Structures are given as structure tokens and as C-alpha cells.
Amino acid sequence: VQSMTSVVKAANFILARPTLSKIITPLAQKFTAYAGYREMGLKFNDLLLEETPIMQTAIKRLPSELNYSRNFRILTAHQLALSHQLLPAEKAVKPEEDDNYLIPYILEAEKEAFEKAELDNI
Amino acid sequence: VQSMTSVVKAANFILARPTLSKIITPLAQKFTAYAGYREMGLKFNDLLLEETPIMQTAIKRLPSELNYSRNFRILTAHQLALSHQLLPAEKAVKPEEDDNYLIPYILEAEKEAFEKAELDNI
Amino acid sequence: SSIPNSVKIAAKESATDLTKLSVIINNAGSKTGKSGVSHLLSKFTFLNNGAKSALRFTRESELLGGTFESKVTRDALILNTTFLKQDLPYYVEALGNVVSNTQFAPHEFNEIVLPTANAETKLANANPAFKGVEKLHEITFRRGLGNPLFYNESTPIKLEEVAQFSKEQFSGENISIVAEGANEEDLTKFVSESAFCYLPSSSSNGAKALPTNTFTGQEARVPSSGASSALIGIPVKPADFGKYEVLSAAIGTSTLPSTSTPLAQIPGATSHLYKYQDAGLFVISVSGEASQVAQGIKQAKSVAESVSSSALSEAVKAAELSVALQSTVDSPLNVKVVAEEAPISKFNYVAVGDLDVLPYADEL
Amino acid sequence: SSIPNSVKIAAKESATDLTKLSVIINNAGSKTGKSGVSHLLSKFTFLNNGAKSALRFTRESELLGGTFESKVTRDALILNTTFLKQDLPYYVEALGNVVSNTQFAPHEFNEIVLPTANAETKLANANPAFKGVEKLHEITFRRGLGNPLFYNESTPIKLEEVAQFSKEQFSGENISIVAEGANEEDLTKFVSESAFCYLPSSSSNGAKALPTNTFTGQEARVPSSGASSALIGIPVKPADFGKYEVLSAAIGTSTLPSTSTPLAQIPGATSHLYKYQDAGLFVISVSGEASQVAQGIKQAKSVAESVSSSALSEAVKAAELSVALQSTVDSPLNVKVVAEEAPISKFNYVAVGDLDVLPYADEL
Amino acid sequence: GVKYTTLSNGVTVATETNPAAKTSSVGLFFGAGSRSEHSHSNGISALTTNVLASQSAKGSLLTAKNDREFNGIIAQTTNDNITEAGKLIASIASNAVDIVEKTDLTKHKQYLSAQASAVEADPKSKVLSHLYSSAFQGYSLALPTLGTTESVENLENQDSLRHLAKHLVNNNTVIAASGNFDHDKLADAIEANLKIAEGVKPEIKPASFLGSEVRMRDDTLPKAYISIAVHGEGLNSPNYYLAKVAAAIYGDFYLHSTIAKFTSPKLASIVQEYNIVESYNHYSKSFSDTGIWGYYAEIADKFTVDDFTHFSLKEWNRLSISISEAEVARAKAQVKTALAKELANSFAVTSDIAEKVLLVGHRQSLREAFEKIDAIKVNDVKEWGKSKVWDRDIVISGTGLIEDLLDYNRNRNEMAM
Amino acid sequence: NYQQPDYSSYLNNKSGQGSRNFTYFMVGSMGLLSAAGAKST
């Protein structure tokens, strides 16, 4: 529901101030680690709700290699959920591998949608 | 339901003998005239039940000009039935135009189907 | 006038209260780059900018009542715009942001430029005359001017190629701004304060197309469904553009739809002199049913030759009219019509459609 | 042996207990009639008969374990059949009812002969080598042997044309029955008592294809998606079939898949001598990626010439092997391999695919 | 230099002389199109004009202008050769009857019949041509401008000679010009060479709009071509520009254009959610006293014709309600540019000046038209929408793959909610 | 294009915006009579 643009704006709002970054960033890292999605072979962007015209547009706009890697990650996560087993730390998605690859495309789609809404509303 | 081949066979079975042709042919002509389909712009073949794979195949193989004429005749009949009016004798389908144009194609399709059934049944 | 980048600027008054401003990229046409890159670039050119997105710029332009178009020619890439005189400072600025800092985003290459380019190519090639003309260029000019005007899948193009063809092109020397209904001083000021002044003075790695090297006598045949066509093409030096123009006006030309011309008496026939910077191509084409075209092209050939010089003289004024009509701002022409004899013995021939019916070059 | 209709009958023993019986219609191939009628006729040939419908004949043949096929070649229309020796009296009779009294029903023209022909044409032309070979024939022989081997929509064909091309063709003089694994006397008796003896002795209005009239030096280019190709074609008189065959076997040929040949050392390259009654075409083809093909075709050309006669001598035995392998019953050949020098200076050239990369004839 | 000149006879010479015109053209027009024909003589106006335009020209380009209402011959030449072109047409016109008397119409009739058939082949021209007729069935305005094959074949020199003598008269004829030339020199040249018979202006045959649907379902075509329009304001109507502004609100669209995804009109964004339509074109065709306002559309999908008509007509409803100021500002600007674009070519303005001088008796330069359009507020458009669109009768035409085009009642009901 | 069938006799004699107004009147009357009957039931 929340626009990816809004959450990115809030994250940059916080990150611009070390007073809050030094407090929240460790908490955010711990919360992402405890979220449990990495151990299933998923990156943050894979969890995003696809069933949204903006999101579907962004995925359709994704490069072939990234799209195939995402397909494999989703399939692996589904298999792990089905088998009720998790990857070990060796095979789990390392924190540095959460590259937020899909955020640029989603932000571009959101910018296009917002421009459309702004222009047609005048 | 009855195969067009069977009815054609029976009609030729009768027509081959003047003893029965001289009796039935006038009756058949009067029955077709009184059938009331001619006054609606329809030929006998237009009345045939299209919803049968053999009939659909026969129609599909129909020449372009005959197919278009049949489409116009069917549309005219639908319009007349809808408007509850009939063509006068001048515009009605004269007996000589009941050319049985569709019978050859239906018979070809029936022969193909019968050959298939006979061959695969051995 | 010009700016330090050596950008040529020409401006003259127009009949109506309508500024027509066009940017002619001298050698960014289909002749210069890899076959078809010019067409794809014409598709990208307005689709994004550093200053404005596609949606914002298109919406603002339509609100302004203007029209913007990007047409690819073998010589140059033309960016046409037609807007009210009031809106000049906007569109010129936009064109600046078009020539430089164009985004070239992949999501546009895959969504709005490949589908659009393929649709345009299919629509144009559906006409056998255009397909025949493209083949005739391909055989008459082996490279450069022979490159197809539109993108084709037979020559895959990667986005990076288009992006690298926009750069090292689009240099100050390599573009010319032409305006009808705009004051030259005002346009010069706007261009100077626009993005154009950030352009490279001279391209470091410009393509520098090789000499034309016209090849005459070649023939080709292009099987095609539907309407057939037959075309005859004479390569010409620039100095002869006059002669052939007169000849065209003598027999009949597409630019001058007019019955009673010698060529119009045979259905589907038309002539036209494609003009370029260093070479030209006089094309006599017949289109329609293959059986009709077979005799029509031979009659057109017999008409192009055997045209009397006395009758050719009256065609001088019609040729001047045709040049003036073709003198539209995007493609200015300085052609001296002379009425001298124009040879045809060096023709190339191309047939499209029912190749079984259409004749071969040895039948003329 | 022959029957009063002048039908030529040849029969010889075969290695296996498999009668291979073929009917070669001498000049019913794509060379003779309107472009493509031979292909459509090949589709029609087994699709009905006066004696047997298509369904009954196909079902009975499959019950008999035999195979029937109709392949169109530029010279002749071949009707192949392969069946156990026991089933000869059936199939020969069938072929009679195929050559004559074929129904030619429109419901088959629109259902089974246009879709099948179009599918085969698309499937074959998908291979750039085959498309290039067809174009190379079209440019080397402008008519007759140059006619495309398959039906194309660019030359519409009406059923009446196919029916009228079956008649006035298919004459006793114009067909030859060739059998492997069948006694000539028995086959002669069966043919005499079959429908063949009802054929016209000589066609009243046979096409009588005009002399071949080979045209050399011409080049063409066929843009295409996917794999590219480049072909070089030398027209040859029948008496030269030996020479070029040896040359082919010297450099490497499709009929003889074998590494270590001079031509095989460059990927995708192969040579083949198409042989016909009155003319032949030696074709050197390279297929694959356009960039690779561009240099591959030049290397193949440089290999075709400069081949030492001493090295050419060893190729004589391989050429005899290739002729024997190509001596399949449907296309018998009598070729005297001689090993003499074979010129290549008179080559035609055709490129398919990424025309931007592939070279032109002037680059060899 | 729009100034007008009236010769010793009642012929008016209107010239849009303007420096910096690339080329100049002169044309003599008489107000007799298909409007002033009848079914037996339909196409005679085009045939007689083609014969005159087929005459030899002294290096000039004679072309025939054929239209529902007006019809004439136009000569285009370089600015220095305009006087010769003027003297030429006067020679053509003064000798019109003599030329037609000896002229063999067989070749011209073939050319005219070929034109008419070619019009039928092109789906857009067929749909529009049928559309205009269906709206005006029963009146002469329903006749095709170029006529029909069977109608043309019956034409004879007597038919045209009767036509010219009825229409080619001083009061029913105008002379148009445009380009860089002196007006007086052209007028003097014409007066010394133009000799035509006097006659009363033929009363313009009346025509009335009748909402109807004409379907030419053609299942062999690759796309469905449809046009839907209402009784739009014609010439000499105060809303003439207002009708054009309303059309520009919905504007044009072409699915395979780079501008498709970024174009302003609301309907353009709506149709792309399913790729409903490949191309559509809103227009305001205006005749002497009657006009047709609507759109032409080509649908490349059999299953989306009803979807398009529903959405396009639903968008028409917004003319009377919820029409945005931005749209009107866009439409006003777009029409002004489109209006100026039409008048760029000297040939185009020569046709235009002849049309107005005949069908309305006066002409407005771009200065006046811009002053009028600029004054169009949102309210004025909304009042026009209620007057001419809201719940008003539509006329429907369609040729290809029409099977999905729902019948008239469905489409017409969408015109109100 | 062609000659349309003559509808002269079928054409209504009444005004362009008036006949649709009368159609509105009776369609709304039918709707509100149906509403009254449904209310009663």
C-alpha cells in the first residue's frame, strides 16, 4: 500500500542525520536479520507485493539476469517453505547481498505514476 | 440426427421408380411450398441443422459466393421473422432456386466420416 | 548566425503565426551509423531528457498546442517542431535537452522504441513502392546512403550502440537549426542560453561517412505479397539535380499530382528525384497489379527516354514549383533547374511482388 | 522397358527386402509451370484419386507398412514409395490412380495443401542456407531452374491452375518409373495393367521449358532474422559436373560430412553441386553468426581457388563416393569424375541475414 | 493582404497575398459539389472539373478540387508565374463548354470511377463517406463527393454541360489566390481573359441530420474501422470553432506512436489499459450549414470494439460535466495550431479562401480566429456539449470486423447517464 | 457511398430533442410505477 517513494523518502529523512542513523541502523540490521527471509534464499525486494500495477511494471522492466535470479530465489524460497527446512548460514543470503536491486525500477515507475497524476489534476 | 447420406439414399430409392415418384414428387413439391420457408427467403439447405461437426465442416468448405448468399438469406429470414412479415410471391424464393447447393459438401463430409469409421473399426 | 560550438542557425519569417523550428543533425541519418540506429535514435530523441521526462514534456507541449516529431532521413536526423510564435523559448530549450542529456533508458528501448520502430517498419514496407525504393537505394549505394531508412531485426541493435551513436554525433558543427516565423536574433539568444552551448564543438569520433560510390547497373528482386511494384533508379551527381528534376516534372512526379502528364497516363506510375548532400537517385516507379505493372514499367521507361527537349522546356516551371514545394524548412534545397538532356541508360532495376510476372532488367 | 505410352520403366535389385518404387515426372518440377505449382501439385498428388480416397489409401498403405512421399525438385516431380516386396501390385496401382484421375478437390486445396505448403515454405526458409540457395538459383537462372522450389503467396495460385498443370503434364513420355528391389517384367506387367496405360502418349501443350540461359556475375542480398549465411554459386554445364564434384569433394561437401577437409576447418561452411538435366550449380555456403560468416565466406572462396591439382587428385575417389551416395533411386546420376581444373571467377554471390556485416561481391 | 476585388461582372477575386510564401496558386471555384447533384447525375461535378483540370497547362499544375459543397480547378505556380496561371484558368473557364463538348469522357470516366473505387477500398474514406451519407440519407448531401461507379458510367457530355451552365455562373463562382504577388496585376489579368455567362446563384439544396447506423461488416479485413458522430456545428455557425475545440479535447491517438503513452487526452490513457484501439481521430467536419462532430477509429482486435465505443462515448459525456480547464486550454491551443497548420501551403489556403467566400460570403483570418478561440471559456464548451452532444442522436458507420460493434441502441444510450 | 433506403414514411414528425424528452418521460414513468408497485408489495 505505502508507496515505495514514501518509504525511501522517510529512510533518507532518517539517514541524513547521524543522530538517528547511529541509533536505528543497527536496529534495522538486526531486525532484517531476525526477519528470517534471508535464510530462505530471499532478498528484501523479493518479498515486495508484486500484485500492483506499479510493481508489475517494475518487474517487467527488470533485466534478464536479475529477473532469472529473482525467479530462482522465489522458487527456492517456495521449496524451502514447502519442505519446512532452511538454508544454513553458508547458503543463506548474506547481508551484503541484499542489494535492493528492484528499488530503482519501482521508484522510476512511481515517479511516472506521480507525474501522470500531478499533470492530469491541474 | 439422420445422416444426409441416408435421406439422399432413400430419396434415390424412391425416385428410381416412376411408380412411386409420380405419386410422391407432386406431394413433396406441395409440402415444400406449404412448408413456408421459401416465403422467408430461405432455401432448404439453409434450414439444415448447422450445429453438427459434419455440417460445420460442410459449411466451412462452401465457396465464398455461396457462403455470402447463404448469410444474406439467413439474415433476411431472421429479419422477416423478427418483423412478422413475409416476402411476396415476387420476392419469395421460387421453387427452381432450391438448388440443393449444400448437399454435395454435406455428402462429401459424410463419406469421409463413414470411411473413417469403417476403416478404424476393422 | 552561429555560436562558439559552430552550430549553424538560420531563421526567416513565415506566412502564418506559426513558428516551425527544426533541428537537422547533418550526418546522424541512416547513412552514418550502423544500419537502423538512426531510426531508433529518432524514436528515443523526445522520449526523455535530463531536464524533463517524456510525460511532462509531452503534456506541456500539448498544453502549448505545439507538435513535435522526429523523422529520420538518409542524410540527417530531423527534429521538427511547430508551435505558436509565443512558445519559442520553451521548445528551443526542450530541443537543447533533447540533443544533449537524453536519458536513453532501457525500459524505453524495450517498451516504446522497439515496438514502435517495428510497427513503423512493417507499416512502411507494407507499401511495395517503399520497399522497392529501399532495395533500390541498397543496391545503387552499396553502403551509407544504401542503409535502410528504418530499423530491421536482421541487424540487432543494442541500447549501448544507440547511446554511443548519440554521443560522438550531435556535435555543434554537425547540427543546423532552421526556423520559419522566428527572429534570428531572438532564436540565437535562446539557443545560446539553452543546452546547445554545452555541446562538443566537434565530435571526437564522428563517423565521417565514406564517399558515396554509386553502383549502376545492379538489379534486385524482392518477393512480396499483395500489391506489386517495379522501380528504375538512376544515380546522379548533385550538379545534375536540376536536369533530372526537370525530366521528372516533364513526365510526372509524386510531388506534383497532376493528370495529363506523360507518366500519369499509365496507372500507378510516378517519378521522383531523391536528393541528398553528395548524391541523388531518380526513381521511376509503377505500383499495382503485377500483370499491369509489368507493362506499365516498360511504358514508363519508354516515356522517360524519348522525351522531346522542346516538351522538356515547358517542364522547367513545373520543376521550379516542385523544388519550391519540396523546399520545406526541414529539407532546404538550392537546385538550379537547367532543362538539359538527362540520360537513363545507366538504370538500376528492382521488382517487388509477383516475381513470376514482373520483368527482368534485360527487358528494361 | 516401355509401354505404348512411351513410359520409361527401369527396375533393378536392392540389397534389402524393400521395394523402393519412384515415379519421376520429368518436367513437372518447379522449373516448368507457374512458380510454385509443382509444390502444390506434390501436395495434391496423394490427397485423392478416382479409385481411392485419401483416407482409404493412406490407411491401407500404413496397414501395409509402406511409406509414400511426394517431393518436388526443379527438374522433376518425384513420387517416392517404399514398401515390402509383397505389396508391389498395390502401390503401383495407387501411383497410376495418382498420376491420372486425381480429384483436385477445393476442400483439400484450402485445408490441406495451402496450409501444408505454407508451413513447409516457412520451415525451409527459416534456414538461411536454404533461402540463400533459392535466391542464388533465382539470380543465376532468371526463369525455369530459378523458380522457387516451394509455393509462395507472392505468386497466387488458383486450383484450376494446378489442375490444368496436372493435365498436359504427366504424359507417358514425361514420366519414368524407377524401382529398386523389383523384377522389371513384373513391374512392367503391373504398370501395363494399371492406370498408366490410360495416360496421353504425348502432352498436347507441354510447357517445354526454354533453354537454361545461365546468368553469371549477378549478386543479391536477402535480409533475414536469426542465423546469417553467405553463398557463392558457379553455373556449370552438364559436362562439367565431374570437375566441380571433384572440387567439392576436395574442399568438403554436405553429402560427405567429414572433418579434416579444407572447407570444414572454417565453422559452418559446406559445398554442394546441385545437378540438373541441362545445367548445374556449384554452391559454396557458410552459415552462422554474421561476423563469423563474413570472414568464413572469404576463406571458403580462397580455399575453392588455389586448390592444388595434386591434392585435387585424391578427391576423385571421394567424388565417386559422393556421386554413389547421391545416386539414390529418385535422382539417378551418371557423372564421370575427371579431376580437371574448375574455374571460380564467374561466381554469383548472395548474402542472407545481417546485411550490415556480410560482405559484398566486390569483396569476394 | 486578404483584400477582395469584384470584376465588372459579379465574380469576386479573393487573394490571400502574403510575402514569404514558398509558392503561389490560383483557382476558380463554383459552388456545386455533390450537394448540388442528384443520384442520376451524381459525380458530374467531379467529372466536369476533372475534364477542365485535365487541360494542357503552360507549365502550371492544374489540379481539381472536389468537395461536397464547392468544386473548382486550382493552378499552382512559382510566384513570378502567377499571372500566367490566372490567365490560364480564365481561358479554361471561358472555354469550359467548348472543351467539354468535344471532350471524350470515356478516359476521364474511367479515372473518376477508379478514384471512387479507390475511395471504397480505403477503409477510412469508406467509413467517413458512408458516415456522411447515413447522417443525411434522403438528401443530396448524402451523395459521394466523387460519385459512384454505376452513377458515373451513365454520365454524358450533356449531363455536364447542363451542370456547368447551371452552376458555372458569375454569381456562383469565385476566384481564389495566394502567394507573393501583386493583387491588382492578377485581378487585371483575370478581367481581360475571363468571360462567363451570367446566372443566379443556385439555391443550396437543404439537408437534415438523421441519426442512423450503417454497418458493412467485413470479416476479411484485419481491423475494425468505425466512426461515430453527431450533428456538429457547420460553417457560418457561431460555434464552428467551439465544435473544433471540443473535438481537440479528445484529439488523436495512435497506439504504435512514441507519443501514445504520454499524450494528454483522457481517452488515450483509458484505452491503453487493454490496448483497446490502435488509432482514433476526433474531427469536426463542417459543411455550408451542417456539420458532423465525432471520431473515426480503427480497432485491430475483434473483441474490443464494444469496449472502445463504451469508453469513447463515456468520455463524450464529460463535455457537459467535469470538463477540466486544462483540457479546454489544451484544446484551444491545439486547435489554434491545427488551424494555422492547414493554412501553411498556398494551395491549402487557396482552397480554404474559396470555400469560405462561397459558403459563408466572408472569411476570418487567423487573427480573428485566435481572438475567438481564446475567448472560449470552460462554460461555453459545457453549454455546447449539452446542446450538441448530451443525449443527442449519433450516426454510426463501420466496415471491418464489425461483429462486436453493439447495435445502435447500446451506443446511443451511452450518450446520456 | 450508395443510395440508402427511403425512410421518409418511418421518420417521426416531432422535434429532435422533444421525442427523446417524451421517451425519458415514459421510461421514468415506467420506472416509478414499478417502484410504487414494488413498494406496495
Side-chain angles (χ1 to χ4, degrees), chain E residues 57-232 234-240:
Chain E
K58 290 57 160 193
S60 306
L61 184 153
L62 283 176
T63 182
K65 179 64 70 177
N66 302 297
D67 203 88
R68 285 287 199 271
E69 302 267 21
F70 81 108
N71 188 359
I73 61 180
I74 303 171
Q76 313 175 219
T77 62
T78 55
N79 300 296
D80 59 343
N81 198 54
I82 200 64
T83 179
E84 304 314 283
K87 282 158 64 189
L88 170 152
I89 62 170
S91 182
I92 301 299
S94 59
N95 290 288
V97 297
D98 187 58
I99 291 167
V100 175
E101 272 181 34
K102 76 189 76 191
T103 294
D104 173 15
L105 294 156
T106 54
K107 194 139 287 173
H108 301 119
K109 286 165 58 177
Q110 291 186 347
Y111 179 51
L112 181 61
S113 60
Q115 273 193 303
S117 296
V119 175
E120 302 294 304
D122 167 29
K124 179 176 185 184
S125 302
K126 179 156 65 186
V127 165
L128 291 193
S129 186
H130 272 70
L131 176 47
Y132 299 151
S133 190
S134 175
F136 312 122
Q137 61 190 268
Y139 301 109
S140 64
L141 184 56
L143 297 173
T145 187
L146 309 184
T148 54
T149 54
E150 65 275 18
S151 60
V152 169
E153 278 294 353
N154 304 325
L155 271 46
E156 185 65 2
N157 294 59
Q158 273 324 310
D159 297 300
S160 86
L161 290 168
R162 181 176 290 85
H163 187 86
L164 288 176
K166 185 175 184 175
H167 292 291
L168 180 56
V169 297
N170 63 353
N171 295 295
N172 188 40
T173 194
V174 57
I175 287 168
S178 176
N180 187 82
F181 59 79
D182 186 75
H183 175 84
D184 290 356
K185 296 186 73 69
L186 181 69
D188 184 74
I190 296 297
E191 184 156 37
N193 286 66
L194 187 149
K195 171 57 178 285
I196 61 178
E198 292 136 1
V200 55
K201 177 159 147 65
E203 74 298 341
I204 191 169
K205 292 172 71 174
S208 301
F209 184 105
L210 179 70
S212 47
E213 173 208 68
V214 57
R215 308 254 287 261
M216 282 136 288
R217 183 141 94 80
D218 213 318
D219 310 279
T220 72
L221 306 197
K223 307 192 291 310
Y225 314 80
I226 61 172
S227 183
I228 306 190
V230 306
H231 188 179
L235 268 55
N236 65 7
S237 183
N239 301 346
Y240 170 43

Side-chain angles (χ1 to χ4, degrees), chain D residues 133-181:
Chain D
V133 167
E134 293 312 301
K135 198 79 200 174
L136 195 155
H137 281 81
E138 175 192 281
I139 67 183
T140 303
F141 316 81
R142 294 181 211 310
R143 210 84 71 187
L145 293 172
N147 275 300
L149 190 54
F150 300 144
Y151 169 72
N152 190 318
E153 301 306 330
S154 68
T155 304
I157 302 287
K158 310 160 43 53
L159 188 154
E160 308 102 349
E161 300 178 71
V162 188
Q164 183 39 40
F165 181 77
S166 175
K167 301 177 189 174
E168 291 286 50
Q169 282 307 332
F170 285 37
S171 198
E173 62 165 0
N174 208 53
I175 79 179
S176 66
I177 312 191
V178 296
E180 300 199 280

Side-chain angles (χ1 to χ4, degrees), chain F residues 28-39:
Chain F
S29 281
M30 182 179 72
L32 289 170
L33 276 296
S34 66
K39 182 63 69 177

Side-chain angles (χ1 to χ4, degrees), chain C residues 221 223-224 353-358 360, chain D residues 28-41 72 74 109 114 117-118 121 125 134 138 141-158 161-162 165 207:
Chain C
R221 319 191 94 226
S224 187
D354 173 328
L355 301 194
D356 182 78
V357 168
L358 272 64
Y360 285 78
Chain D
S30 78
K31 78 192 282 186
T32 303
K34 187 173 175 179
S35 172
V37 302
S38 188
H39 182 76
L40 299 182
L41 181 58
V72 54
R74 303 199 210 271
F109 183 49
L114 289 175
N118 292 345
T121 295
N125 287 354
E134 293 312 301
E138 175 192 281
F141 316 81
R142 294 181 211 310
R143 210 84 71 187
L145 293 172
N147 275 300
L149 190 54
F150 300 144
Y151 169 72
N152 190 318
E153 301 306 330
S154 68
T155 304
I157 302 287
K158 310 160 43 53
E161 300 178 71
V162 188
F165 181 77

Side-chain angles (χ1 to χ4, degrees), chain B residues 60-61 112 115 118-119, chain D residues 53 55-56 59 107 111:
Chain B
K60 173 158 54 46
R61 311 159 155 199
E112 288 163 355
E115 266 196 329
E118 151 176 50
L119 286 170
Chain D
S53 67
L55 188 42
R56 194 181 281 310
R59 290 291 221 271
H107 78 82
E111 289 177 9

Side-chain angles (χ1 to χ4, degrees), chain E residues 328-350:
Chain E
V328 175
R330 170 172 65 74
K332 285 195 292 188
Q334 281 191 247
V335 168
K336 290 164 69 179
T337 292
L339 201 73
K341 184 175 306 319
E342 262 175 29
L343 274 55
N345 207 6
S346 72
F347 174 85
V349 55
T350 303

Side-chain angles (χ1 to χ4, degrees), chain E residues 224 226 271 274-278 297-312 401 403-406:
Chain E
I226 61 172
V271 300
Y274 276 88
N275 300 357
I276 295 296
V277 61
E278 170 172 30
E298 311 194 347
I299 297 89
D301 191 340
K302 321 152 78 165
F303 300 90
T304 63
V305 176
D306 63 358
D307 293 343
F308 184 63
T309 55
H310 171 77
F311 278 114
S312 60
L401 295 155
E403 183 178 1
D404 179 77
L405 177 64
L406 284 190

Side-chain angles (χ1 to χ4, degrees), chain D residues 273-339:
Chain D
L273 178 72
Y274 299 91
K275 287 162 284 298
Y276 310 118
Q277 307 266 351
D278 63 18
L281 180 85
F282 174 61
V283 180
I284 298 165
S285 61
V286 179
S287 311
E289 180 190 66
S291 54
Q292 176 278 341
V293 174
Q295 77 194 19
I297 189 60
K298 289 186 286 185
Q299 277 147 283
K301 174 71 172 323
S302 179
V303 166
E305 51 185 36
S306 83
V307 60
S308 64
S309 306
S310 59
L312 194 61
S313 175
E314 292 84 3
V316 170
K317 191 61 62 67
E320 290 183 354
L321 160 64
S322 185
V323 167
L325 281 161
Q326 280 169 90
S327 179
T328 187
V329 69
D330 53 338
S331 74
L333 320 173
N334 173 36
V335 174
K336 164 70 181 143
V337 286
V338 65

